Design a protein around this nucleic acid. Structure first.
Ligand SMILES: [Ca+2]
Ligand SMILES: [Ca+2]
Ligand code: NA
Lengths: 236, 245
DNA sequence: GCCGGTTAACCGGC
DNA sequence: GCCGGTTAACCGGC
């Protein structure tokens, strides 16, 4: 992580001291590496004005996996112009991107209202993560990027920060990730609760996640009969 | 439908309306309020009015009995603690996962309206209409309690496009869920098991009774669930086994 | 034309 | 404590 080293600094400037308000901090203390996902894409294409067409521009990523996680559609990529730049997207994989010397940190910020009942938010699609692990293995890309999370807790007429949390997805035990199939097949968890005791290699994590994903896929399929078929059979 | 008789006018008044550069639902509410003041309510407003007129009824248990309908209780009520803690000083407010956007009621009959805004400037994408599971439970409760002439679930689509520093409405569509062919409803399991369709495209030729609609939907639901189960193996299991064996 | 996955984030049952 | 369903629409591959 590029943020981990300066976590204390961020935590001390947030607690009490809005959404993406952390981006400001990062874009000032790491202005050299901080980007919104859409800003990184514009930056990458502006730097190579000689490369046109989506097929060519996609090659700019130099990584089938990163291409998969960060790129926009073919049309959007081909239609990309210097006078027609990319804008933020609700569907974007990451909130903030930190890249240095060909290594990437996909950072997601999660805001939690410590006043309401605890309800783990959608973290990332378990399916997208499976395709990611598959691409990591197929292309042997095990030392290219990390997916990390920064949690910001908040709470009379103003909403101030009370604490923060930071965790790395790849440091968590794969089989411990809760996949909520109904909730758009999303992994869900509060950052503060995310396990960080995995000790294996990045390759072992990917294989372990795939076994977990496949197993949960089987379990969900069977459970659908139990909850969506059995109780309604008597009406038909 | 209660808004049906005055639909042509809603359509005319809505086309042209603008919002500061989703909120069109509030404008929909506005008109209905001025044209059907006594039948129009936000879902939370309806709940507040019901409890306000029965101040002596306290506790979630007693308050739940005020709905005098298992199906309506299921579709409209807030949780037990929320119902327990309600008070004139602690009223209900909008809730993200409430079933309906607007309720129109008259003489014990209910119309649950869900406004569906649509950005007409982009590639058509059928939005989440309602949970296929919530709908199945609803049909099951209708059958168990014989409530087949109590309520309707309808949709009002508001099409809009960017026009300067605001969004403007270019057209609208209205359709009724119970007039559609149940077996043709698209259930997108990944998308929170939601039924998906464009109001403008929903068929309206069902020829059976409400009871028949419920049974037919239940048949469709169960069949699609069975298919999804097996389908999950082909899409989420088979393609990744090569990485764990 | 056809088809379905993704983000953001949120209560409430027992 | 443990567990999971719901609303809002929305996009891009072949
Ligand atoms: Ca996020
Ligand atoms: Ca709506
Ligand atoms: Na809905």
């Amino acid at each position: 992580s590029f943020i981990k080293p300066i976590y204390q600094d961020i935590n001390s400037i947030l607690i009490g001291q809005f959404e993406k308000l952390v981006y400001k901090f990062l874009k000032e203390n790491l202005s050299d590496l901080t980007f919104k996902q859409y800003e990184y894409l514009n930056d990458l294409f502006m730097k190579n004005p000689a490369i046109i067409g989506h097929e060519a521009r996609y090659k700019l990523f130099n990584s089938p996996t990163l291409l998969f996680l960060l790129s926009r559609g073919k049309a959007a990529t081909e239609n990309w112009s210097i006078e027609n730049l990319f804008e933020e997207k609700q569907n974007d994989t990451a909130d903030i991107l930190l890249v240095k010397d060909q290594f990437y940190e996909l950072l997601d910020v999660k805001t939690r209202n410590i006043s309401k009942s605890a309800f783990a938010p959608n973290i990332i699609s378990a399916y997208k993560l499976a395709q990611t692990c598959a691409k990591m293995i197929d292309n042997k890309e095990f030392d290219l990027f990390d997916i990390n999370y920064l949690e910001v807790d908040w709470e009379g007429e103003d909403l101030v920060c009370v604490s923060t949390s930071f965790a790395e997805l790849f440091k968590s035990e794969p089989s411990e990730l809760y996949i909520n199939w109904a909730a758009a097949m999303q992994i869900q968890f509060h950052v503060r609760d995310l396990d960080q005791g995995f000790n294996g290699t990045r390759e072992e994590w990917a294989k372990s996640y795939l076994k977990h994903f496949v197993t949960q896929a089987e379990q969900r399929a069977i459970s659908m009969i139990d909850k969506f078929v059995k109780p309604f059979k008597k009406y038909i």
